[PDB]
């Protein structure tokens, strides 16, 4: 067969590889039939037949029809039913389908082959009500999709019926009413077309075939191929398959199931069956489905076939399946099959079980768990979330995934108090500012009134993998009365509240939180992931606790420890930085600097203790100094600064003005500051090495790395590196001990990428700051472009927000260029990236292909990065 | 001669091309002697002799000394004087000199060959006072430079003399005192060295030679060659030349002159002569020089030789010369010669005259006028600035070159009032802000108290080529009493004041301003410049007047007309922009937009009228909208906004907050704004084409070009270009006429350079915004990096400020890449640059070599750009 290919259980003319000719659906049907699946018989008319059709002036090419007839006879012989025969009726389904997804194609046409006589022959076992209802629908469907008759013309007839009979829910019409409606519908053909409904089944088929071919040249189909650049294709195929029913007595039925539990992964058929009826019934309230056992009970012969079909599906497709099947008088029929959707929990278990069952190897199992699946297992989740549907009192934005349960509080201070007592608090505030960070961190969940997916609470919460429901308009926080009205409900300080950051749901009361996992499957799965990936995955952390959390998540070290964050850790430390900034003499400045030394030395010791055995990369002071000044009205900033440092009103104002900048992103900061005030870098370097030594003397293994930020020339880097090495030697001489360490730089200035070869002579490693690199490369001030990014995305100007998904064409090109030039100068140059791009799958895949050595992201994104670093190689 | 080369008038063993062996000075001596110049006889010991010396363990290589003796005998025979002979004495000068400039080399040693007897033989015609004084100095010089004897040891003897005699100005010592001092100095040799001063002339020479060779390996010489990467050189040469005197009677003398007037260029010897004496005398107050005629009078034979020497110098070196000469008993001797420094006025005249005299061709004349020379002729200048030395009452920073004379005023408003009456005003203010721009522009000169070379007044003033003296600390402006105290002096409103922006001088009264030129030489010179250059030079102008000024300066069009500047032109226009911004409904917004239309349409008509015949490139709204908001306390900004627009306090504050940004350089501006509010670009495009048509109907030739700013993708550009073309066609259809025009883009985002090929499919021209490109490439916020650039420059981290001198290695690489990729996509793509780099010589040279089509700079920088665009090809 060259233009028409039939198929059936264990028989098919085409095979799974003919996506071009048979089309995706046609090729898959051949595949399904070829492996022994109980698929109803049918045939496919090649895409080549469509092309010949279009060229011949949209006319049916010579010989084709002869083949189509050849194919149906085979189907008729296979089924033991003939087209247009009331005693042994054969109804057909006609579907389109090209090689790739394609809109504007003819919609599916069911029950083709009906007429007055066949309709009565169908009412025989399936009943009059259904037979004539199907006939009414078919006349409409076939009439509109094949004969191009407006739907309104038919509904125009049906409405009058119930408008006179007295109903609106068609499920109320009778067999005779439908018979009468069949008569009215046929008049529509005569009125609109000028000729009667084609009662000859073969005429229907022919018109259906031509309609599908014609569908290829539909407006939407053409637009898509020109508004989504495509070519070659050559046309669409037509899939004709025999119809089957489950309403032909108590020996028939329809059902749906997953070859495995989509929620837990348990290896057991999960679904439901409906005896003597079809899917429609349920939707109306006409019928209520049972569980699969009813099928094993009433139809053991068909059930056994269902099990063999399921094992064959998993055995051949190597994947859990979601299927739709029908049992027609003890005979099982496999209709639609597709990879089953599932929870992360289910995804990991199924992947591991299939490896243990010897169905697939690790390399393939890795592709069975999507980043989205793995992320569900990284945050807390509710046991039975369905049981709280009535307790839900509001829905806000799902700013940050995960379930949280705790007592409501209204200040960062109170969330901190709760945390200090080892208790769970839900911080509820109008919106958050950098002043609530401590409390936001202390709470188990955050709920705000204003702000969207990019508000302060959402962003910060996502960075910690902490549950957060944002922009929940239906809430009013009464700071003064210690209460919050949520959806008219009043919650007072101390009462329990639940939050689902994945849905944005605000649940009243304390819902159960799913107990921790004991399976061991995630551990097994992740071991295969770690075996396959070449990229190392590090974490960005600034405190001992985050370092520990990163390690428990599998981080191989810390790629970015931000020293400025360490000073923002407490009011006392911030005040200390301010004292240094306001110091009126060099003696008090050094005195203030010395205080910064213990803080730093102390924090690194704890960080080094937590990362015992792993490299820890510390970045020097990054922000401009004004970021350490209090915020608010100039009057209050001055008042506060004088009270905290001793400066008088005059010098306080002068200094604030001197530290003010027009574009703080690109001013007096980073190495520019460490170069102009070398004592700053000497202080931090001193703290790093003394902490490193002190821990090494306690048996801790320390691999310190110092990163110089915002370098644009090799001279800036060489200056800081020289300073760092001089301090290293002094400290090692004073302590009488020496340890290894590396000095490197953050590559975030476009110029640094351009002169990367020279910068590599001074740097032992490259740490890409793609966030800032993107800012400078796009000339985008992330804090301010939010005002037009949405417009750019909606108008097709941007495909993705460059700050979330690495811009491979632009920013990525500078990343590749810098990596190549740096490595030519220093062959063993370690190159990596630190930032959210280091935790975003498509970006991680790019970094892997670009040849980087590692990525570094937030502690809870680490497992996601690991997963993505493996999948790109598989 | 292989290691020693003699030379004299018309005789030389070496030639001008042996810079390697003879060294720069040695080769030039050979050249001078080779063309017939009356240079005293001498010889040069090759740099190869020095290398042999160093290798032989700093020992004199075999045969060398024999040659040195051979050379002096020749010199002795040439002069008819012998070394170490009191009756016919021969004194020598010993100088070092490698192939290239080299510090740490032996300092010049004069009068070598002296001793007791020769000293007396010298007192014969030159006198006792001089002979013994020279002997005292030589003992010290030779002793310190050749014998390494501390100077302190000698001054230690001289001081005691006057300390006992009773003087401090050596010019007071007598012949006998010096004779006695000669005795004391010789004791120093015995005390410090352990042996007496070498009285044998040949011993002196030998030691002198070795000292010079040794000088090559001096600390400073080595540092320079290692702290200024150099190699190959191979050593230094030694130049020995016969000494000559002009104090041997009234038949001798010394003089200096320029072969042409260094101030005006007049082709006449300009200098002075001193009869029977040497240069020293003048410095002490011992003698006062006459004019050159005294020489022609008293020594016609020598004068005639001087004229032939001068003609030979200009004829061979093709350049005006500054020389030092000595007449020893009727015999003329040419000592030092070098290209003469001169004013711009002189530079242009000399260059043109040498072409007319047939001495040089245009291509060479072009190199005779430096940018610095040409700039002097582009601004107003004082006639006789020396005559005002007593009227100078203060000196501030020379923020902007040019002379200005006008009446003192203290407000921008008053300078504007003065300008409106066609009168000259000098605006005197503490410092300036963007609010004084109108008055600053109206004044003929600006004087501020605070601020340096980068203050607001300095920057703006330089942009207009307007005279400005900045940071003049010695002034206090009494706004309330309409007066200013300058250096204790009181100047009241209306009194005359003069300013020299080139020196920073504040002159009391009204000094004469040099009358305009009538020569025609600058016109001639510039015609050769324009013939040679390939790059076109355009001007950046936003008003009809600046467009006219640009044209009078030779601009070939306007490469950048900034539309936002047009709105900042008056309070009324600014208020109109604010009304658009605060409009509460779309109807009032369009109403406000329409008002912006006449303003725009009106200004372009005037600009098009002024550039009749030349292309005019207009850039769409560039700044973020908040730049159009009033400045000050938030309370006043709101009050003012409500009063001017009708908004209430609530909506005013909300909108200000919404327009606020963290980094205004990279926010919601440029095409981002024109894309999100298309009506803005439709309004400006409409104004452009209607103005273009309206002028075309009046006989004006208009070549409008529209530039889209801040593009980072081809999609942003395509969106704006589509809008611009739709408006073009509507306007042409409404008016019933069509004209040509181009649409292009400003390339200033690094990413734009990376995807330049795609952007060229939409753009017909590329306009590089290197200022912003530099900002984003370096990650430098020009407004804020001033705080550490000075440190970077002093520590060698940066060679130049990237905003003043194009960073060829980094920014330039993106410029080359964008140009090449853009042109591959659109072969005839016009590529240029707009900004101060377009007026900076080294930057313009780079742009020319990079293949750009044009540069565009400020109106008064246009001639400088033209000049630089020619010199890089010559
Ligand atoms: Mg950064
Ligand atoms: Mg710009």
> Quick check: B751 contacting A, CB < 8 Å?
yes
Distance CA A648, CA A651 (A): 6
> Quick check: B587 contacting A, CB < 8 Å?
no
For residue B655, which residues of chain A lie inside 8 Å, CB to CB?
none
Distance CA B493, CA B499 (A): 16
In the numeric block, which tokens belong to residue A57?
């002036």
CA B622 to ligand 2 center in whole angstroms? 7
CB contact under 8 A, B750 and A748: no
- Taking the CA of residue A500 and the nearest CA in chain B, the distance in Å comes to 31
The experimental resolution of this structure, in angstroms, equals: 2.3
With beta carbons less than 8 A apart as the criterion, state whether A194 and A28 touch. no
Method by which the model was determined: X-ray
With beta carbons less than 8 A apart as the criterion, state whether B639 and B602 touch. no
Distance CA B384, CA B264 (A): 12
> Quick check: B715 contacting A, CB < 8 Å?
yes
Residue carrying the six token digits 């496919």: A44
Distance CA A163, CA A365 (A): 58
C-beta atoms surrounding B453 within 10 Å = 13
CB contact under 8 A, A788 and B755: no
- Active-site residue B561, yes or no? no
* H helix intervals, B80-174: 116-126, 128-145, 151-165
Q: Are residues A416 and A370 in the same domain?
A: no
Distance CA B825, CA B828 (A): 9
Angle at A592 between CA A588 and CA A598, to 5 degrees: 145
CATH of the domain at A332: 3.30.470.20
Distance CA A542, CA A770 (A): 19
- Bridge-based pairing of strands A765-768 and B467-470 is unpaired
Domain limits for position A168: 113-197
CATH of the domain at A155: 1.20.80.30
CB contact under 8 A, B666 and A777: no
CA distances from A217 to A151, A210, B773 (A): 21, 12, 48
CA distances from B11 to B8, B46, B653 (A): 5, 17, 88
Please tell me which residue of chain B has the smallest CA distance to A813: B754
HSE of B503, CA atoms in CB hemisphere, 13 A: 17
Distance CA A805, CA A836 (A): 9
In this complex, the residue of A666, A676, A780 whose CB is nearest that of residue B779 is A666
Name the nearest CA neighbour of B646 among B581, B572, B594.
B581
Most distant CA atoms of chain A, gap in Å: 108
For residue A676, which residues of chain B lie inside 8 Å, CB to CB?
787-788, 791
CA B744 to ligand 2 center in whole angstroms? 14
Q: Are residues A268 and A364 in the same domain?
A: no
Distance CA A25, CA A863 (A): 36
Distance CA B470, CA B456 (A): 9
With beta carbons less than 8 A apart as the criterion, state whether A492 and A477 touch. no
For residue B783, which residues of chain A lie inside 8 Å, CB to CB?
661-663
The dihedral sign for the CA sequence B535, B541, B542, B546: negative
Measured between its terminal Cα atoms, the distance across chain B in Å is 38
With beta carbons less than 8 A apart as the criterion, state whether B45 and B78 touch. no
CA B489 to chain centre: 33
Distance CA A146, CA A488 (A): 54
Most distant CA atoms of chain B, gap in Å: 108
CB contact under 8 A, A795 and B713: no
Residues in contact with A541: Cβ distance below 8 Å, sequence separation at least 6, in sequence order: A547, A549, A550, A555, A558, A560, A561, A607, A859
C-beta atoms surrounding B169 within 10 Å = 9
Q: DSSP secondary structure string, B169-236?
A: SGGG--HHHHHHHHHHHHHHHHHHHSS-----HHHHHHHHHHHHHHHTT-HHHHHHHHTTT-------
- Bridge-based pairing of strands B854-857 and B830-834 is parallel
Residue A813 parent element (H or E): helix A811-825
Distance CA A21, CA A220 (A): 22
Residue B513 is classified by DSSP as B
At residue B517, the 3 state secondary structure works out as coil
With 0-12 / 13-18 / 19 or more C-beta atoms within 10 angstroms meaning exposed / middle / buried, residue A622 is buried
Name the nearest CA neighbour of A157 among A132, A182, A175.
A182
E strands within B341-474?
A: 392-395, 397-400, 403-409, 425-429, 445-448, 467-470
CB contact under 8 A, B810 and A784: no
In the numeric block, which tokens belong to residue B505?
């001088």
Distance CA B636, CA A819 (A): 52
In this complex, the residue of B667, B713, B778 whose CB is nearest that of residue A781 is B667
HSE of A455, CA atoms in CB hemisphere, 13 A: 25
With 0-12 / 13-18 / 19 or more C-beta atoms within 10 angstroms meaning exposed / middle / buried, residue B61 is middle
With beta carbons less than 8 A apart as the criterion, state whether A830 and A759 touch. no
Residues in contact with A180: Cβ distance below 8 Å, sequence separation at least 6, in sequence order: A161
Q: Are residues A604 and A519 in the same domain?
A: no
CB contact under 8 A, A663 and B664: yes
C-beta atoms surrounding A51 within 10 Å = 17
The dihedral sign for the CA sequence B387, B391, B394, B400: negative
- Taking the CA of residue A634 and the nearest CA in chain B, the distance in Å comes to 10
Q: DSSP secondary structure string, A646-697?
A: ---HHHHHHHHHHH--S-GGGSS-THHHHHHSHHHHHHHHHHHHHHHHHHHT
- Bridge-based pairing of strands B765-768 and B830-834 is parallel
Q: DSSP secondary structure string, A355-416?
A: HHTTSS-HHHHGGGS-HHHHHHTTS--BS-GGGGTTTEEEE-EEEE-SEEEEEEESSHHHHH
Residues in contact with A661: Cβ distance below 8 Å, sequence separation at least 6, in sequence order: A624, A626, A667, A668, B781, B783, B784
> Quick check: B574 contacting A, CB < 8 Å?
no
Distance CA A707, CA A726 (A): 16
CB contact under 8 A, A666 and B781: yes
In the numeric block, which tokens belong to residue A153?
């013309």
Name the nearest CA neighbour of A93 among A108, A114, A74, A78.
A108
Distance CA B315, CA B324 (A): 18
CB contact under 8 A, A749 and B809: no
- Taking the CA of residue B256 and the nearest CA in chain A, the distance in Å comes to 47
Distance CA B847, CA B533 (A): 12
* H helix intervals, A536-585: 544-552, 563-567, 571-582
The dihedral sign for the CA sequence B141, B142, B145, B149: negative
Distance CA A689, CA A732 (A): 8
The dihedral sign for the CA sequence A665, A668, A672, A674: negative
In the numeric block, which tokens belong to residue A150?
């407006």
Chain B 108-147, residues with CB within 8 Å of chain A CB atoms: none
Residues in contact with B464: Cβ distance below 8 Å, sequence separation at least 6, in sequence order: B441, B858, B859, B860
Q: Are residues B308 and B178 in the same domain?
A: no
- Bridge-based pairing of strands B475-478 and B331-339 is unpaired
CB contact under 8 A, B776 and A750: yes
* H helix intervals, B421-570: 437-442, 456-463, 521-532, 544-552, 563-567
Distance CA B537, CA B539 (A): 7
Chain A 27-56, residues with CB within 8 Å of chain B CB atoms: none
Residue tagged active-site, from B561, B671, B834, B857: B834
- Taking the CA of residue B306 and the nearest CA in chain A, the distance in Å comes to 53
At residue B746, the 3 state secondary structure works out as strand
- How many residues appear in chain A? 874
C-beta atoms surrounding A424 within 10 Å = 17
Residue carrying the six token digits 């908004």: B647
E strands within B449-525?
A: 467-470, 475-478, 483-486, 489-492, 496-500, 505-508
Q: Are residues B175 and B38 in the same domain?
A: no
Q: Are residues B108 and B171 in the same domain?
A: no
CA A451 to chain centre: 22
Measured between its terminal Cα atoms, the distance across chain A in Å is 38
CATH of the domain at A61: 3.30.1490.20
- Taking the CA of residue B391 and the nearest CA in chain A, the distance in Å comes to 37
CA B289 to ligand 1 center in whole angstroms? 67
C-beta atoms surrounding B338 within 10 Å = 12
In the numeric block, which tokens belong to residue B558?
């306007």
The dihedral sign for the CA sequence A98, A104, A108, A109: negative
In this complex, the residue of B716, B780, B797 whose CB is nearest that of residue A666 is B780
In this complex, the residue of B672, B775, B781 whose CB is nearest that of residue A788 is B672
Q: Are residues B154 and B221 in the same domain?
A: no
Q: Are residues A550 and A449 in the same domain?
A: no
Alpha-carbon dihedral angle through residues A374, A376, A379, A381, given to the nearest 10 degrees? -150
- Which residues are A498's β-sheet partners? A405, A507
CB contact under 8 A, B675 and A792: yes
Name the nearest CA neighbour of A237 among A85, A95, A443.
A95
Residues in contact with B203: Cβ distance below 8 Å, sequence separation at least 6, in sequence order: none
**Test the B interface: residue of A664, A674, A784 with most B CBs within 10 Å:** A784
With beta carbons less than 8 A apart as the criterion, state whether B674 and A792 touch. no
Report the number of secondary-structure helices (H) and strands (E) in chain B. Answer: 35, 30
Residue tagged active-site, from A468, A561, A671, A834: A834
Distance CA A179, CA A809 (A): 63
C-beta atoms surrounding B761 within 10 Å = 12
Name the nearest CA neighbour of A117 among A88, A94, A142, A137.
A88
At residue A643, the 3 state secondary structure works out as helix
For residue A808, which residues of chain B lie inside 8 Å, CB to CB?
none
Name the nearest CA neighbour of B278 among B324, B318, B223.
B324
Q: Are residues A182 and A283 in the same domain?
A: no
Residue carrying the six token digits 């000028």: A194
Q: Are residues B120 and B236 in the same domain?
A: no
For residue B807, which residues of chain A lie inside 8 Å, CB to CB?
751
Q: φ and ψ at A682, to 5 degrees?
A: -65, -40
CA A783 to ligand 1 center in whole angstroms? 14
CATH of the domain at B350: 1.10.189.10
Name the nearest CA neighbour of B838 among B790, B801, B806, B797.
B806
CA A746 to ligand 1 center in whole angstroms? 8
CA distances from A497 to A111, A217, A614, B195 (A): 53, 56, 40, 103
CA distances from B110 to B39, B94, B189 (A): 16, 7, 19
> Quick check: B820 contacting A, CB < 8 Å?
no
Distance CA B827, CA B768 (A): 18
Chain B 146-165, residues with CB within 8 Å of chain A CB atoms: none
Distance CA B859, CA A825 (A): 45
Angle, in degrees to the nearest 10, between helices A634-645 and A649-659? 120
Distance CA A583, CA A603 (A): 24
State the total domains in chain B.
6
CA distances from A829 to A812, A824, B166 (A): 18, 9, 74
Residue tagged active-site, from A456, A565, A626, A719: A456
Distance CA A505, CA A391 (A): 10
Q: Are residues B67 and B148 in the same domain?
A: no
Distance CA A23, CA A99 (A): 4
In this complex, the residue of B676, B776, B797 whose CB is nearest that of residue A788 is B676
Distance CA A844, CA A870 (A): 10
CB contact under 8 A, A666 and B748: no
CA B434 to ligand 2 center in whole angstroms? 19
Q: Are residues A620 and A483 in the same domain?
A: no
Residue tagged active-site, from B456, B565, B626, B837: B456
With beta carbons less than 8 A apart as the criterion, state whether A708 and A745 touch. yes
CB contact under 8 A, A712 and B673: no
- Taking the CA of residue A620 and the nearest CA in chain B, the distance in Å comes to 18
Distance CA A23, CA A16 (A): 10
- How many residues appear in chain B? 874
CA distances from A465 to A399, A444, A462, A864, B646 (A): 10, 10, 5, 12, 47
Please tell me which residue of chain A has the smallest CA distance to B787: A668
- Active-site residue B50, yes or no? no
Distance CA A637, CA A695 (A): 40
Distance CA A668, CA A675 (A): 10
For residue A755, which residues of chain B lie inside 8 Å, CB to CB?
809-810
How does A652-669 read in b/e, with b if 16+ C-beta sit within 10 Å? Answer: bbebbeebebebbbbbbb
> Quick check: A780 contacting B, CB < 8 Å?
yes
CB contact under 8 A, B751 and A798: no
Name the nearest CA neighbour of A265 among A531, A525, A35.
A525
């Amino acid at each position: 067969k060259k233009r028409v290919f039939h198929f059936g259980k264990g028989k098919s003319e085409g095979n799974k590889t003919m996506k071009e000719l048979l089309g995706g659906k046609g090729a898959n049907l051949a595949e399904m039939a070829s492996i022994g699946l109980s698929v109803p018989p049918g045939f496919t008319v090649s895409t080549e037949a469509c092309q010949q059709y279009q060229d011949a002036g949209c006319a049916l090419p010579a010989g084709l029809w002869a083949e189509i007839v050849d194919g149906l006879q085979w189907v008729e012989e296979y089924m033991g039913a003939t087209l247009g025969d009331p005693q042994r009726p054969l109804l057909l389904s006609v579907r389109s389908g090209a090689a790739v997804s394609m809109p504007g194609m003819m919609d599916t046409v069911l029950n083709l082959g009906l007429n007055d006589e066949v309709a009565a022959g169908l009412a025989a076992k399936s009943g009059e009500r259904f037979a004539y209802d199907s006939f009414r629908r078919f006349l409409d469907m076939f009439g509109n999709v094949v004969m191009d008759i407006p739907r309104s013309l038919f509904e125009e007839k049906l409405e009058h019926m119930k408008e006179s009979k007295g109903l609106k829910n068609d499920t109320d019409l009778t067999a005779s009413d439908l018979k009468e409606l069949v008569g009215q519908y046929k008049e529509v053909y005569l009125s609109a077309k000028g000729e009667p409904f084609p009662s000859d089944p073969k005429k229907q088929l022919e018109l259906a075939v031509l309609a599908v071919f014609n569908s290829w040249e539909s407006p939407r189909a053409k637009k898509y191929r020109s508004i989504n650049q495509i070519t070659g294709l050559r046309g669409t195929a037509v899939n004709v398959q025999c119809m089957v029913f489950g309403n032909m007595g108590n020996t028939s039925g329809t059902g749906v199931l997953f070859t495995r539990n989509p929620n837990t992964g348990e290896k057991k058929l999960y679904g439901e069956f409906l005896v003597n009826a079809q899917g429609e019934d349920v939707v109306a309230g006409i019928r209520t489905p049972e569980d699969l056992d009813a099928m094993k009970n009433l139809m053991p012969q068909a059930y056994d076939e269902l099990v063999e079909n399921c094992n064959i599906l998993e055995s051949h497709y190597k994947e859990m399946q979601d299927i739709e099947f029908t049992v027609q008088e003890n005979r099982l029929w496999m209709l639609q099959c597709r990879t089953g959707k599932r929870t992360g929990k289910s995804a990991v278990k199924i992947a591991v079980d299939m490896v243990n069952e010897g169905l697939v190897e690790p390399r393939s199992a890795i592709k069975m768990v999507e980043p989205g699946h793995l992320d569900q297992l990284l945050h807390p989740q509710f046991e039975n979330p369905s049981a709280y549907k009535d307790q839900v009192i509001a829905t806000g934005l799902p700013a940050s995934p995960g379930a949280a349960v705790g007592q409501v509080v209204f200040t960062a201070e109170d969330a901190e108090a709760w945390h200090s007592q080892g208790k769970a608090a839900i911080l509820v505030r109008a919106e958050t500012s950098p002043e609530d960070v401590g409390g936001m961190h202390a709470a188990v969940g955050i709920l705000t009134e204003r702000g969207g997916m990019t508000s302060h609470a959402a962003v910060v919460a996502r960075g910690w993998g902490k549950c957060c429901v944002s922009g929940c308009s239906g809430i009013r926080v009464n700071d003064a009365e210690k209460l919050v009205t949520i959806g008219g409900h009043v919650l007072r300080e101390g009462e329990w509240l639940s939050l689902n950051g994945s849905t944005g749901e605000v649940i009243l009361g304390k819902q159960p939180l799913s107990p921790p996992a004991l399976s061991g499957d995630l551990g097994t799965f992740m071991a295969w992931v770690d075996d396959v990936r070449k990229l190392k995955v590090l974490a960005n952390a600034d405190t001992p606790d985050d370092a520990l959390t990163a390690r428990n998540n599998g981080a191989q070290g810390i790629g970015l420890c931000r020293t400025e964050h360490m000073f923002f850790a407490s009011d006392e430390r911030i005040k200390a930085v301010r004292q240094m900034i306001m110091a009126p003499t060099l003696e008090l400045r050094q005195q203030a600097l010395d205080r910064l030394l213990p803080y730093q030395r102390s924090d690194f010791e704890g960080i080094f203790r937590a990362m015992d055995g792993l490299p820890v990369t510390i970045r020097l002071l990054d922000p401009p100094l004004h970021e350490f000044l209090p915020e608010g009205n100039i009057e209050d900033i001055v008042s506060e600064l004088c009270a905290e440092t001793g400066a008088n009103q005059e010098d306080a104002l002068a200094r604030i003005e001197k530290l003010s900048e027009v574009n703080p992103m690109l001013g007096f900061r980073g190495c520019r500051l460490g170069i102009s005030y070398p004592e700053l870098t000497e202080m931090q370097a001193r703290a790093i090495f003394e902490a490193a030594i002190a821990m090494t003397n306690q048996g801790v293994q320390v691999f310190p790395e110092i990163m110089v930020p915002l370098v644009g020339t090799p001279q800036e880097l060489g200056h800081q590196v020289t300073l760092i090495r001089q301090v290293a030697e002094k400290v090692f001489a004073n302590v009488g001990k020496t340890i290894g360490y590396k000095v490197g730089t953050m590559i975030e200035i476009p110029r640094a990428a351009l002169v990367a070869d020279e910068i590599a002579e001074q740097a032992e490693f490259f740490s890409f700051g793609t966030n800032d690199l993107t800012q400078m490369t796009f000339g985008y001030s992330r804090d301010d472009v939010g005002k037009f990014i949405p417009v750019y995305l909606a108008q097709g100007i941007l495909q993705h927000d460059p700050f979330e998904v690495l811009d491979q064409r632009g920013v990525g090109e500078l990343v590749k260029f810098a990596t190549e030039r740096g490595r030519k100068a220093r062959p063993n140059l370690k190159v990596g990236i630190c930032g959210e791009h280091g935790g975003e799958p498509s970006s991680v895949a790019f970094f892997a292909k670009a040849g980087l050595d590692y990525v570094s992201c937030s502690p809870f994104r680490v497992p996601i990065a690991r997963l993505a670093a493996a999948q790109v190689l598989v």
